[PDB]
Amino acid sequence: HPETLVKVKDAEDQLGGRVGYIELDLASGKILESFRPEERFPMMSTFKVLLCGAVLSRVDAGQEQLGRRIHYSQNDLVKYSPVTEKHLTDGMTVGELCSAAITMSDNTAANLLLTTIGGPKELTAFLHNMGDHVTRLDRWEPELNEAIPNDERDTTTPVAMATTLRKLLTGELLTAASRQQLIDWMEADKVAGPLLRSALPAGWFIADKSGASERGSRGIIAALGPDGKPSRIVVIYMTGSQATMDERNRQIAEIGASLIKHW
Ligand SMILES: [Ca+2]
Structure with a gap:
């Protein structure tokens, strides 16, 4: 241990x-521990939380509504769309699309949302505007998952992501209602069980978003804490490895167990 x-x-x-x-540290923003904090890593699906932060900002400004229904066709579906593929008839609201992109990592959902805001480049422009010049999204799903050995497109760094996530969840950037919605979506994450969640004791709070891409990228961003309240932000990224998805998951769980047991 x-x-x-x-x-x-x-x-x-x-x-x-x-x-x-x-x-x-959630309250203050102080870095408690780090390793390769400023080195670049593929973002993978973790960008989906950032995307929805930009969506919620539009909502706060009366430029968007979570209830606005969005219809799409069979053509619009890309690979891994467990939720969107079920709503070709009824479509989905902006809020449901964010739930799908965050809680199931739905690719089409994310693409649809990107359209609503003006594409990948417009997310990056939102990020620049809040103090994050490091993180960048350049491509749509699923091209952003190629994690080309050390390529700067679709990347962030552990410190930038964690800092950006923390501003999103706790800063005056979003309204209280919006920032609660964002963390609510992350808390409802359904596809990260084998990661930090597998190491989580009873009564603990966690809201997270995982990612996985090409050779052999794997990551997770998280707000967690004991007593049903998040008190820390954790960000883990991995890339370059030839190991299986299982081993990469396991290593993240063991990092999680260490984090918990030394809390
Ligand atoms: Ca080393």
């Missing part, structure tokens, strides 16, 4: 590639 930093390094030793890690 090695310290958190020791486990992250151990993970990198076992997996190959690089493992990036950061841990923020």
